[PDB]
Design an enzyme around this catalytic site. Structure first.
Site, PDB file in Angstrom:
ATOM      1  N   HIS A  61       0.761  -1.229   0.000  1.00  0.00           N
ATOM      2  CA  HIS A  61       0.000   0.000   0.000  1.00  0.00           C
ATOM      3  C   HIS A  61       0.819   1.324   0.000  1.00  0.00           C
ATOM      4  CE1 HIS A  61      -4.232  -0.342  -0.445  1.00  0.00           C
ATOM      5  NE2 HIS A  61      -3.940  -1.644  -0.370  1.00  0.00           N
ATOM      6  N   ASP A 125      -8.161   3.535   8.861  1.00  0.00           N
ATOM      7  CA  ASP A 125      -9.461   3.639   8.194  1.00  0.00           C
ATOM      8  C   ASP A 125      -9.632   2.421   7.288  1.00  0.00           C
ATOM      9  OD1 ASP A 125      -9.927   6.224   9.257  1.00  0.00           O
ATOM     10  OD2 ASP A 125      -9.566   7.269   7.388  1.00  0.00           O
ATOM     11  N   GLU A 240     -13.307  12.054  13.227  1.00  0.00           N
ATOM     12  CA  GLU A 240     -12.737  12.388  11.938  1.00  0.00           C
ATOM     13  C   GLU A 240     -13.512  13.579  11.364  1.00  0.00           C
ATOM     14  OE1 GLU A 240     -10.551   8.212  10.655  1.00  0.00           O
ATOM     15  OE2 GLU A 240     -11.567   9.426   9.124  1.00  0.00           O
TER      16      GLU A 240
HETATM   17  C1  LIG Z   1      -3.282   1.808   0.201  1.00  0.00           C
HETATM   18  C2  LIG Z   1      -3.873   2.462   1.420  1.00  0.00           C
HETATM   19  C3  LIG Z   1      -3.027   2.876   2.448  1.00  0.00           C
HETATM   20  C4  LIG Z   1      -3.536   3.397   3.637  1.00  0.00           C
HETATM   21  C5  LIG Z   1      -4.929   3.492   3.805  1.00  0.00           C
HETATM   22  C6  LIG Z   1      -5.767   3.107   2.760  1.00  0.00           C
HETATM   23  C7  LIG Z   1      -5.260   2.601   1.569  1.00  0.00           C
HETATM   24  C8  LIG Z   1      -6.213   2.246   0.451  1.00  0.00           C
HETATM   25  N1  LIG Z   1      -5.497   3.929   4.984  1.00  0.00           N
HETATM   26  C9  LIG Z   1      -4.691   4.263   5.967  1.00  0.00           C
HETATM   27  C10 LIG Z   1      -5.271   4.737   7.191  1.00  0.00           C
HETATM   28  O1  LIG Z   1      -6.452   4.909   7.389  1.00  0.00           O
HETATM   29  N2  LIG Z   1      -4.357   5.091   8.158  1.00  0.00           N
HETATM   30  C11 LIG Z   1      -2.996   4.997   8.046  1.00  0.00           C
HETATM   31  O2  LIG Z   1      -2.306   5.276   9.025  1.00  0.00           O
HETATM   32  N3  LIG Z   1      -2.449   4.561   6.891  1.00  0.00           N
HETATM   33  C12 LIG Z   1      -3.254   4.226   5.893  1.00  0.00           C
HETATM   34  N4  LIG Z   1      -2.706   3.806   4.713  1.00  0.00           N
HETATM   35  C13 LIG Z   1      -1.235   3.798   4.604  1.00  0.00           C
HETATM   36  C14 LIG Z   1      -0.516   2.595   5.205  1.00  0.00           C
HETATM   37  O3  LIG Z   1      -0.466   2.705   6.627  1.00  0.00           O
HETATM   38  C15 LIG Z   1       0.909   2.485   4.656  1.00  0.00           C
HETATM   39  O4  LIG Z   1       0.820   2.255   3.251  1.00  0.00           O
HETATM   40  C16 LIG Z   1       1.850   1.456   5.286  1.00  0.00           C
HETATM   41  O5  LIG Z   1       3.044   1.381   4.509  1.00  0.00           O
HETATM   42  C17 LIG Z   1       1.223   0.090   5.490  1.00  0.00           C
HETATM   43  O6  LIG Z   1       0.862  -0.503   4.221  1.00  0.00           O
HETATM   44  P1  LIG Z   1       1.480  -1.984   3.926  1.00  0.00           P
HETATM   45  O7  LIG Z   1       1.143  -2.949   4.995  1.00  0.00           O
HETATM   46  O8  LIG Z   1       1.032  -2.484   2.572  1.00  0.00           O
HETATM   47  O9  LIG Z   1       3.068  -1.883   3.872  1.00  0.00           O
HETATM   48  P2  LIG Z   1       4.103  -1.600   2.696  1.00  0.00           P
HETATM   49  O10 LIG Z   1       3.537  -0.507   1.875  1.00  0.00           O
HETATM   50  O11 LIG Z   1       4.320  -2.882   1.892  1.00  0.00           O
HETATM   51  O12 LIG Z   1       5.453  -1.244   3.517  1.00  0.00           O
HETATM   52  C18 LIG Z   1       5.659   0.113   3.992  1.00  0.00           C
HETATM   53  C19 LIG Z   1       7.079   0.274   4.490  1.00  0.00           C
HETATM   54  O13 LIG Z   1       7.286  -0.587   5.636  1.00  0.00           O
HETATM   55  C20 LIG Z   1       8.196  -1.627   5.314  1.00  0.00           C
HETATM   56  N5  LIG Z   1       7.688  -2.880   5.874  1.00  0.00           N
HETATM   57  C21 LIG Z   1       6.592  -3.597   5.463  1.00  0.00           C
HETATM   58  N6  LIG Z   1       6.283  -4.597   6.252  1.00  0.00           N
HETATM   59  C22 LIG Z   1       7.253  -4.546   7.242  1.00  0.00           C
HETATM   60  C23 LIG Z   1       7.478  -5.331   8.394  1.00  0.00           C
HETATM   61  N7  LIG Z   1       6.781  -6.427   8.694  1.00  0.00           N
HETATM   62  N8  LIG Z   1       8.485  -4.960   9.221  1.00  0.00           N
HETATM   63  C24 LIG Z   1       9.227  -3.894   8.899  1.00  0.00           C
HETATM   64  N9  LIG Z   1       9.124  -3.097   7.833  1.00  0.00           N
HETATM   65  C25 LIG Z   1       8.114  -3.484   7.031  1.00  0.00           C
HETATM   66  C26 LIG Z   1       8.378  -1.599   3.794  1.00  0.00           C
HETATM   67  O14 LIG Z   1       9.636  -2.153   3.397  1.00  0.00           O
HETATM   68  C27 LIG Z   1       8.181  -0.103   3.506  1.00  0.00           C
HETATM   69  O15 LIG Z   1       9.357   0.664   3.750  1.00  0.00           O
HETATM   70  N1  LIG Z   2     -13.206   8.084   4.213  1.00  0.00           N
HETATM   71  C1  LIG Z   2     -12.132   7.298   4.269  1.00  0.00           C
HETATM   72  O1  LIG Z   2     -11.572   7.012   5.338  1.00  0.00           O
HETATM   73  C2  LIG Z   2     -11.608   6.744   2.983  1.00  0.00           C
HETATM   74  C3  LIG Z   2     -12.480   6.617   1.899  1.00  0.00           C
HETATM   75  C4  LIG Z   2     -12.037   6.117   0.685  1.00  0.00           C
HETATM   76  C5  LIG Z   2     -10.708   5.751   0.540  1.00  0.00           C
HETATM   77  O2  LIG Z   2     -10.133   5.528  -0.709  1.00  0.00           O
HETATM   78  C6  LIG Z   2     -10.095   4.303  -1.222  1.00  0.00           C
HETATM   79  F1  LIG Z   2      -9.528   4.324  -2.424  1.00  0.00           F
HETATM   80  F2  LIG Z   2      -9.417   3.425  -0.486  1.00  0.00           F
HETATM   81  F3  LIG Z   2     -11.334   3.866  -1.373  1.00  0.00           F
HETATM   82  C7  LIG Z   2      -9.822   5.850   1.603  1.00  0.00           C
HETATM   83  C8  LIG Z   2     -10.253   6.356   2.832  1.00  0.00           C
HETATM   84  N2  LIG Z   2      -9.331   6.556   3.893  1.00  0.00           N
HETATM   85  C9  LIG Z   2      -7.972   6.367   3.810  1.00  0.00           C
HETATM   86  O3  LIG Z   2      -7.433   5.698   2.935  1.00  0.00           O
HETATM   87  N3  LIG Z   2      -7.280   7.002   4.808  1.00  0.00           N
HETATM   88  C10 LIG Z   2      -5.871   7.201   4.888  1.00  0.00           C
HETATM   89  C11 LIG Z   2      -4.980   6.858   3.865  1.00  0.00           C
HETATM   90  C12 LIG Z   2      -3.630   7.114   4.030  1.00  0.00           C
HETATM   91 CL1  LIG Z   2      -2.530   6.662   2.759  1.00  0.00          CL
HETATM   92  C13 LIG Z   2      -3.129   7.703   5.177  1.00  0.00           C
HETATM   93  C14 LIG Z   2      -4.021   8.042   6.181  1.00  0.00           C
HETATM   94 CL2  LIG Z   2      -3.425   8.818   7.621  1.00  0.00          CL
HETATM   95  C15 LIG Z   2      -5.401   7.798   6.070  1.00  0.00           C
HETATM   96  C16 LIG Z   2      -6.320   8.043   7.249  1.00  0.00           C
HETATM   97  C17 LIG Z   2      -7.126   9.312   7.090  1.00  0.00           C
HETATM   98  O4  LIG Z   2      -7.997   9.415   8.207  1.00  0.00           O
END
Ligand SMILES: *Cc1cc2c(cc1C)nc1c(=O)[nH]c(=O)nc-1n2C[C@H](O)[C@H](O)[C@H](O)COP(=O)(O)OP(=O)(O)OC[C@H]1O[C@@H](n2cnc3c(N)ncnc32)[C@H](O)[C@@H]1O
Ligand SMILES: NC(=O)c1ccc(OC(F)(F)F)cc1NC(=O)Nc1cc(Cl)cc(Cl)c1CCO
Length: 460
Positions: A61, A125, A240
């Site tokens: 992600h 979220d 929020e």
């Molecule tokens: C795509 C997305 C992201 C997202 C989100 C909604 C969507 C559609 N909503 C979020 C939310 O409400 N609140 C929030 O705090 N973040 C939100 N995100 C972002 C998300 O937290 C980040 O993308 C985060 O990186 C976690 O995503 P993911 O699990 O897929 O991890 P990654 O992208 O592959 O890795 C990110 C970095 O961390 C390192 N990594 C990955 N796994 C590990 C472990 N197990 N240990 C140590 N390091 C790790 C990767 O190498 C990279 O640097």
């Molecule tokens: N309303 C919603 O919460 C939301 C709705 C649609 C959506 O888009 C979709 F494509 F996934 F559908 C993502 C949503 N929220 C979301 O992704 N939040 C989010 C992401 C990152 Cl990368 C970082 C941090 Cl901090 C946050 C949290 C903010 O509160």
């Protein structure tokens, strides 16, 4: 124990992320079965003459290639193995659960609910994110004002360092590594186990939305709501907000709150909601209410995801920008960004905004927050149009205008999931004291800069 893969679909997936821009390919994808396998591969990289890049991939992600290991190895942390059951500790006063670093929060929730009706108290979220991935950042949603981010709700970790050594850490043992790893952008090791704090889960949610046309009233109400809880008083469990277009003011602000309840509190929920709402200054007759199970509430963004995949609007570039903005500078942000940079007919996605309390964030961790007690998260979650590169280009220029605005007016904003790539940008991001603690930690736990090199902080 593990398996190296050179499968094209495995290489393709490990070479992209949700951002849809950064595309650095690895040589192979490693599929581990346990922690010792990850230690083996990191051990091999540390001992190798060249010192090839190793990055864990959660669920992919990342917005800008943070999980990519250019000509190295991507560790596919996903599992799909025996799972540890929740545990009660009379010493900690509550429950915890040991989870694999690659585990998705959605799978953790389902496991803890089916084993004692327990659940983590601080969310994101979106739940299709890995535990190790969010813990390497912060893990934020509407509960962070009260419980702190997910990095404030973990007791212990098993970390595979950049030297391929497996280390158990917590506040009492190897705390430097523990606090360093938390919000540490994968720089000091791979999380193979995290011990997540749990509470007895609520069964249902009273989900409320109320509209505002005045930003001063909206922010004043958000700031009052996040201050509630002294002596265990009446409060919402989630706070929020989001910015909405007109279609008093051309910009509307939606306040989003929840009130969690179970069988015991089901009777008092209606009065509690009306008492808290009565103290607010939202527009009369703009209250929208939903009542649904806890799991359904937490999974609301996955439902939005399904609608997008059905329209071919999910596999599009996502130049998402996340900022922490000091509360003293938030009013100017409305004028300059919401009405300024994003004003007019701009061409898709939410813009979320809500405050949090810095005291819920441990200053010992690697996470970078503004130097103010109350700060907002401003999340610009705008997606590019499908198969339209110019759409991504226009959104990128807008993001740079938002950043330029903050720099040009001296707003001490900090980027969450920082996308910096130059050393002077990282030094500014962290500040002198934090940069020194960061680099020293890197020297000790990843001296060859093998881990999470896609973050672009250190070089071998
Ligand atoms: C795509 C997305 C992201 C997202 C989100 C909604 C969507 C559609 N909503 C979020 C939310 O409400 N609140 C929030 O705090 N973040 C939100 N995100 C972002 C998300 O937290 C980040 O993308 C985060 O990186 C976690 O995503 P993911 O699990 O897929 O991890 P990654 O992208 O592959 O890795 C990110 C970095 O961390 C390192 N990594 C990955 N796994 C590990 C472990 N197990 N240990 C140590 N390091 C790790 C990767 O190498 C990279 O640097
Ligand atoms: N309303 C919603 O919460 C939301 C709705 C649609 C959506 O888009 C979709 F494509 F996934 F559908 C993502 C949503 N929220 C979301 O992704 N939040 C989010 C992401 C990152 Cl990368 C970082 C941090 Cl901090 C946050 C949290 C903010 O509160």
């Amino acid at each position: 124990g593990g398996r190296l893969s050179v499968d094209a679909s495995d290489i393709a997936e490990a070479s992209r992320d949700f951002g849809g821009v950064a595309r650095a390919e690895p040589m192979a994808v490693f599929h581990p079965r346990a922690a010792g396998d990850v230690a083996g591969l990191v051990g091999a990289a540390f001992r190798s003459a060249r010192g090839f890049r190793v990055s864990a991939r959660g669920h992919g992600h990342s917005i800008s290639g943070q999980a990519q290991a250019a000509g190295g190895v991507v560790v596919d942390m996903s599992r799909g193995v025996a799972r540890a059951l929740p545990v009660h500790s009379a010493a900690l006063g509550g429950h915890y659960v040991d989870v694999w670093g690659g585990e998705l929060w959605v799978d953790v929730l389902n496991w803890t609910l089916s084993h004692g009706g327990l659940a983590p108290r601080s969310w994101t979220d979106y739940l299709y994110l890995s535990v190790g991935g969010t813990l390497s950042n912060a893990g934020i949603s509407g509960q962070a004002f009260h419980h702190g981010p997910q990095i404030s709700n973990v007791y212990e970790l098993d970390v595979v360092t950049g030297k391929g050594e497996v280390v158990t850490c917590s506040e009492t043992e190897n705390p430097d590594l523990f606090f360093g790893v938390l919000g540490g952008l994968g720089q000091f090791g791979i999380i193979t186990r995290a011990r997540i704090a749990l509470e007895r889960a609520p069964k249902r949610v009273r989900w409320i939305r109320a509209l505002y046309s005045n930003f001063s009233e909206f922010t004043a109400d958000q700031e009052r709501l996040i201050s509630l809880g002294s002596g265990g008083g009446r409060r919402f469990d989630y706070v929020e907000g989001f910015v909405v277009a007109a279609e008093h003011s051309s910009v509307l602000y939606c306040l989003e709150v929840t009130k969690n309840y179970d069988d015991e509190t089901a009777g008092s929920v209606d009065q509690d909601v009306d008492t808290l709402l009565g103290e607010l200054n939202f527009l009369p007759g703009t209250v929208f209410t939903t009542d649904l199970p806890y799991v359904d509430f937490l999974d609301r963004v996955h439902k939005a995801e399904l609608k997008l995949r059905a329209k071919g609007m999910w596999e599009v570039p996502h130049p998402w920008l996340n900022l922490f903005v000091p509360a003293s500078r938030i009013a100017d942000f409305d004028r300059g960004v919401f009405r300024g940079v994003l004003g007019g007919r701009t061409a898709g996605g939410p813009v979320l905004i809500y405050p949090m309390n810095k005291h819920k964030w441990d200053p010992r961790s690697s996470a970078v927050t503004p130097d103010e007690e109350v700060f907002y998260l401003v999340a610009f979650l705008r997606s590019a149009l499908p198969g339209a590169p110019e759409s991504l280009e226009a959104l990128a220029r807008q993001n740079q205008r938002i950043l330029d605005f903050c720099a040009g007016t001296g707003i001490g904003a900090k980027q969450y999931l920082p996308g910096h790539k130059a050393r002077h940008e990282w030094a500014e991001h962290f500040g002198a004291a934090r940069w020194d603690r960061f680099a020293r930690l890197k020297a000790e736990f990843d001296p060859r800069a093998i881990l999470a090199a896609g973050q672009g902080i250190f070089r071998p």
